[PDB]
UniProtKB/Swiss-Prot annotation:
Sequence positions that bind Mn(2+): E225
Intracellular or extracellular location(s): Vacuole membrane; Cytoplasm, Cell cortex; Endoplasmic reticulum membrane; Cytoplasmic vesicle, Autophagosome membrane
Annotated effect of mutating R63A: Decreases nucleotide binding by a factor of 2.5 and reduces catalytic activity. Decreases nucleotide binding by a factor of 20 and abolishes catalytic activity
More details: Present with 8710 molecules/cell in log phase SD medium.
Entry similarity comment: Belongs to the VTC4 family.
Effect of a null allele: Leads to a decrease in intracellular arginine, consistent with a role for polyP in vacuolar arginine storage.
Disulphide linkage map: none
Annotated domain remarks: The SPX domain has very high affinity for inositol polyphosphates, such as myo-inositol hexakisphosphate and 5-diphospho-myo-inositol pentakisphosphate (5-InsP7), and moderate affinity for inorganic pyrophosphate. Its affinity for inorganic phosphate is 2 to 3 orders of magnitude lower. SPX domains may integrate inositol pyrophosphates (PP-InsP)-dependent signaling to adapt cytosolic phosphate concentrations to different metabolic situations.
Domain of life: Eukaryota
Active site: K257
UniProt induction comment: By low phosphate.
Protein name (Swiss-Prot/TrEMBL): Vacuolar transporter chaperone complex subunit 4
């Protein structure tokens, strides 16, 4: 079989109609469970933003992500690294999990790499080479956090719903809704975070009505992702071809939420905008 993954933008007010159509064909796989929140880090010079915008060889993006509501304790510390084609290497994404109570301390170097990985080394369930890999990752994140004086700058939030028939991978779909960016920085003298890795005056309670609305960017689209596995040489189901060819959706290229968030919410601060 051949794979295809495609993303489409959807007008917000077509969401219900779109979900109804999908549900005729694929079933859905508290309301807070569907939340995905990521806190992107950068510094006062927006060094990481510019590095990612320009696609510098080696340009890193750093974000801390959690799935679900505010009782979720597992925080994923994530780093993306851009590699230019000329290197012969592919860009990479990597992450490791941390309990929430260790996040501030880890980022500050008060909770050490050895401490992060002590228990997983003790249980020896993970191959040591993988643990080594994760240690190099954690150390390098800790280092850039300090060296580049990074702090929380923008949050991305959205809800993800997935639709899938068990045992049939011909078509799998996800729908991301409530796409939102929220300021996390202190650049205007407003201390949004009070030394924490994320602001705590909101949770996953979109659309965050309690906040200063200038801190919020509500994205004007939802995102549909369709993944196909098509036996060569058959066709994808007719209903999918019809849907994707309809007025309800439009194909879109790769779009950075980090870049969109900074460029939109801190427009007065950037001197290059996509």
């Amino acid at each position: 079989f051949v794979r295809q993954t495609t993303k489409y933008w959807v007008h917000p007010d077509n969401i219900t109609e779109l979900k109804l159509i999908i549900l005729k064909h694929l079933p859905v796989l508290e309301r807070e469970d569907s939340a995905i929140t990521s806190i992107y880090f950068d510094n006062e010079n927006l060094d990481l933003y510019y590095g990612r915008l320009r696609k510098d060889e080696g340009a890193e993006a750093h974000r801390l992500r959690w799935y679900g509501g505010m009782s979720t304790d597992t925080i994923f510390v994530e780093r993306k690294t851009h590699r230019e084609d000329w290197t012969g290497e592919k860009s990479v994404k990597a992450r490791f999990a941390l309990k929430e109570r260790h996040v501030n301390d880890f980022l500050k170097g008060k909770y050490t790499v050895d401490q992060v990985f002590a228990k997983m080394r003790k249980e020896g369930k993970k191959p040591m080479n993988e643990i080594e890999n994760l240690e190099a990752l954690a150390s390098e994140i800790q280092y850039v956090m300090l060296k580049k004086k990074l702090r929380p700058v923008v949050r991305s939030f959205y809800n993800r719903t997935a639709f899938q028939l068990p045992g049939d991978a011909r078509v799998r779909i996800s729908l991301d809704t409530e796409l939102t960016m929220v300021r996390e920085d202190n650049f205007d003298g407003v201390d949004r975070t009070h030394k924490n890795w994320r602001r705590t005056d909101i949770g996953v309670d979109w659309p965050f009505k309690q906040l200063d609305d200038k801190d919020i960017c509500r994205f004007p689209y939802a995102v549909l992702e369709v993944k196909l596995q098509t036996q060569l040489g058959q066709e994808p189901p007719e209903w999918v071809r019809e849907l994707v060819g309809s007025h309800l959706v439009e194909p879109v290229p790769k779009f950075s939420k980090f870049i969109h968030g900074v460029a939109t919410l801190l427009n007065d601060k950037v001197d290059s905008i996509p």
